[PDB]
Ligand binder design. Structure first.
Ligand code: ANP
Ligand code: MG
Ligand code: MG
Length: 356
């Protein structure tokens, strides 16, 4: 079994995703995404081996007929998904990049001498890295996995196949305290002006934590307003809101549609309703009550009510979120909120392995 990601980090955390070029993985239909992982010889889990983009049904080449059953098997691209580490942990970041580059060289040899065969759980020649296979019911094949033989491909990685995910303490968003927080706050959807706006609205209110309430208000309002902008731009059905009722032609297959995810640029990966927990019951009520007019002064009543209710009932920005991640003290953990960089910016390029 592939170990689950660790959920707790002392400070800000980072994970990476790297889709490989030059090969496919073929597996039975409806298989689990994870088929293995690479760890250090010391035992530290570095990254998972996963199936990513469905490339069609797998057809075992006739010249490689082995009496085995490959019925209903599907071909997918391979994506290497790191186990998160601390953003300032240089050795952990570097070991992940080196282990990914080593595995690409190991894949290059595998498609040359063992094409259309599963990856074997081996140790690297230098003893640094160990492959563990959690699903033996798979094969690795060069190119698109149609031909028995490769085109002598070198297994590679590129910025177009790369993402980075940053986790920070939820209470930090809007404080601009660290370079990571400042990079996240530069997200085009984030409206820092909403912080001072909340303060003006709540002068007569005796709030338990005014600065924290203002930060949460700005973060949530920015997400709710951006969701409404995207639902209108792409014609997305949100709860009971019908884009066709506002003469908008549906133009995406929901919130999880890759082009909708790309429009966020810095994609929230945590369920928005979780942040309410960092506030007192009273402060959370004051924040929530003030969001509704922000939507209603910009969007129709129906779109405003549907976006508000969707996120209130625990709606996700773009499918299954990372909602159990924590930061700070291990004994008294605080909520961490995660963000996916759809395109890795210059500031995070050093966290990604480069073939060249
Ligand atoms: N606590 C954390 N802090 C920072 N990054 C994290 C943390 N937990 C997970 N990540 C990273 O966030 C990403 C998680 O993506 P994941 O949750 O596996 O979704 P997925 O199902 O693989 N995506 P998909 O391709 O749509 O199926 C990886 O880059 C992880 O390394
Ligand atoms: Mg992934
Ligand atoms: Mg991604």
């Amino acid at each position: 079994a592939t170990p689950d990601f660790p959920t707790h980090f002392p400070k800000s955390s980072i994970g990476i995703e790297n889709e490989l070029a030059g090969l496919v993985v073929a597996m039975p239909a409806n298989s689990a995404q994870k088929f293995g992982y690479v760890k250090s010889a010391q035992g530290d889990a570095l990254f998972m081996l996963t199936k990513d983009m469905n490339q069609g049904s797998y057809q075992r080449p006739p010249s490689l007929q082995d009496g085995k059953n490959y019925q209903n098997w599907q071909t997918h691209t391979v994506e290497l998904v790191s186990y998160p580490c601390e953003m300032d942990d240089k050795a952990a970041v570097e070991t992940r990049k080196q282990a990914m580059l080593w595995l690409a060289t190991h894949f290059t040899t595998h498609i040359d001498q063992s094409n259309h065969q599963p990856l074997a759980p081996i140790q690297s020649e230098d003893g640094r890295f160990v492959i563990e296979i959690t699903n033996a019911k798979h094969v690795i094949a060069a190119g698109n996995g149609i031909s028995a033989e490769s085109q002598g491909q070198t297994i590679t990685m590129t910025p177009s196949g790369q993402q980075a995910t940053v986790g920070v303490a939820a209470k930090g968003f809007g404080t601009s305290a660290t370079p990571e927080l400042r990079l996240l706050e530069s997200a085009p959807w984030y409206q820092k002006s909403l912080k001072s706006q909340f303060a003006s609205l709540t002068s007569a209110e005796n709030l338990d934590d005014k600065e924290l309430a203002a930060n949460v208000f700005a973060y949530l309002t920015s997400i709710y307003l951006k969701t409404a902008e995207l639902a209108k731009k792409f014609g997305i059905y949100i709860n009971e809101w019908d884009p066709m009722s506002e003469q908008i032609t549906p133009n995406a297959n929901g919130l999880t549609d890759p082009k909708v995810k790309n429009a966020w640029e810095i994609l929230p990966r945590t369920k928005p309703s979780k942040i309410v927990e960092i506030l007192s019951k009273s402060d959370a009520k004051a924040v929530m009550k003030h969001i509704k007019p922000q939507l209603q002064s910009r969007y129709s009543e129906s779109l405003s009510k549907n976006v508000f209710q969707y996120f209130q009932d625990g709606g996700e920005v773009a499918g299954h979120g990372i909602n159990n991640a924590t930061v700070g003290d291990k004994h008294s953990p605080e909520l961490a909120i995660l963000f996916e960089f759809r395109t890795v910016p210059n500031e995070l390029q050093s966290y990604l392995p480069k073939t060249e």
